[PDB]
Symmetry: D2
Subunit: 198 residues, 4 copies
Amino acid sequence: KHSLPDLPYDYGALEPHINAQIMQLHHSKHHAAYVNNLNVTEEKYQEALAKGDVTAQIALQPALKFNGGGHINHSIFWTNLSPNGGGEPKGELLEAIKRDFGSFDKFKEKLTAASVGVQGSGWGWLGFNKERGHLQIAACPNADPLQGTTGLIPLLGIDVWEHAYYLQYKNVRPDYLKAIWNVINWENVTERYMACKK
Amino acid sequence: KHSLPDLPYDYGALEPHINAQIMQLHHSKHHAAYVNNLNVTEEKYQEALAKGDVTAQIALQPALKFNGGGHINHSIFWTNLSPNGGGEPKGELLEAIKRDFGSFDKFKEKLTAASVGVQGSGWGWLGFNKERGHLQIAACPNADPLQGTTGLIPLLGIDVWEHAYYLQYKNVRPDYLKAIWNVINWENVTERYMACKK
Amino acid sequence: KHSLPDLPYDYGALEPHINAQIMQLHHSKHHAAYVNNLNVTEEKYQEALAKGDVTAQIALQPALKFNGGGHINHSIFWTNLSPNGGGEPKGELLEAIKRDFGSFDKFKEKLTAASVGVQGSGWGWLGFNKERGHLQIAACPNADPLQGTTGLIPLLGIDVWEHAYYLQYKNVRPDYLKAIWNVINWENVTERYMACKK
Amino acid sequence: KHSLPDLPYDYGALEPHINAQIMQLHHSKHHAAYVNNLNVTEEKYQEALAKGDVTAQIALQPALKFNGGGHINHSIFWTNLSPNGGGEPKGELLEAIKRDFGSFDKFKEKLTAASVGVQGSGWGWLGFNKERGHLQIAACPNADPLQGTTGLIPLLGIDVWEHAYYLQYKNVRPDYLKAIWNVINWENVTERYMACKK
Ligand SMILES: [Mn+2]
Ligand SMILES: [Mn+2]
Ligand SMILES: [Mn+2]
Ligand SMILES: [Mn+2]
């Protein structure tokens, strides 16, 4: 049974960059629904798989990827943020960023561009390409998870679904992106990065 | 030059089913952007087409479908709503609905189901199938327009992008759907339906 | 465990409409491969599901749908064909056709055009819409199965992947479509129809 | 007006790696058809664009991308092959390869696996990422062109549609991939590389 993880901080801990109403709804409503729906979906799948019902298994893919991806993305997202975030990463992560994107500011502009560029619902990601052994930026549609659909290891994710910012930033997604850089938990991003150094 | 059409009513004309803040932003911000971006896109396309640059034409498809679809959908959407909407359609349209969906209430449940079922951004539609000569319900992803991607003639569209209801209904999309039935302009839907009787 | 079914006739039984080489290859190589890969993917999914590994389950989706769909489609396809086939169906099925498509010839035209219209690999299908209670034609990309992705019940399928006709008809897919009508097992299509119209 | 280019060699010049029948069919039938349909679609788009008919422009997208992409891909493909080809590239290109893929053999392995991995119709490509300033391998579905959909500059393409190898290698796509390495025109791949690495 997958479960809803607690936030590492309070709902208003990220004010004024992301207000508490958004954090409260995003976590307790959106994330909560994905976990429960994901559990329901896996259950149906085990039955379909047990019976060898290929048609059912295929019909259940949209729900599994959507709710499963919803669970994966937000679980990472919460840890990607922090009341004491912002600033810049250090050591290896920072050097990697400089190496792969020219500079930290150029990196931010690129991830921002990818996130702002998403048409409809989706996510912007800073991931690690194990095969090439370098950082890479990618955008994912709807709730599709990064690793499961591209193979890249997620390091930092920027949720650009409208529910992630509309109450506060309305249609101006760029304002949301500008603000979120202030709460990025580079300590966590660094840990995820070092995890791929093994 | 395509242009932003005026609303057939005031921004607060649909209260309390869809508040004025949503109508104001949806029209003056979201729709406005699509028109302007659509004009910019067509311009680039004419240049690419004139030069026979197939690569550019293909690279411009996402922007053209997205902004073009955005313009088409909202233009129809505004006319699909009315302060004096609600109730049920009559004559041929109503009979068609009964014939194709059992009853008007069954129809509403089906269009509601399709709209609520959209994962991510999108639209729910009541369209007309010219080939089969009957009504049909379809859901479209992101800003993809109904006729351009399915061939069906749009009659009634229900926007389920989060910007269409989040400020007022938050994550509870079903509340938004319940409410919108009160402002549906069946006079306009009927006119669009009769237009296919030719 | 899924298994490759025996063909219900000799590899050269559909001559000269679909030659023996194609039939033998199509069955012993193409269908056989889908079965083996299907069984491999399902086993991996069983492990992923047991571990609650959502990322793995999602990554396995393309292979599960491709091979599973391949198995589903070809299994139906073989029964849809017969050496003593051809001609036209009778009774209710024929009535439903003329009713839903105008006439048999118009039906042939519609299905043929859907099949010839497939860009890349895919299938054309005559299915049954249990919701609307009527026949419906649809086309599916690559190996995507009809029911698992559209909800329609498969009645008659026409494989338009190039391996299904290239050796004999080369690039002329229309000649292939014209020929196949001579071996359609209308008795089997009738069974499938009456089976879901209970 | 787009035109079908002449092959830079005899139809049987790539024997026995890719036989004459395939070459002649591939060029005079498949590529020729893409050109004609491309010219038809573009003209229709010119009319739609002139009328500000967004619905028509969007409906024409599938045909424009399919035939336009078909033209782009095959035009490049012919130049990528040569009767006196094979072996390994030299200078900077060879340096970039060993650098971005470990070695030439690892590169062959990577491109081969990407090409053999295509489910349905598609292409495997060795391209150049101008943004990252390095080589990159990618696979495109159906006739979708590399640059128009990924932004990568095409250097070497491997057509894995079944019409590109079925007559000779049947279902064994890997044998086809192994053989094609003998006719790769590394001189042309080098030109494309140096052309975008200015
Ligand atoms: Mn979210
Ligand atoms: Mn909208
Ligand atoms: Mn087949
Ligand atoms: Mn080809």
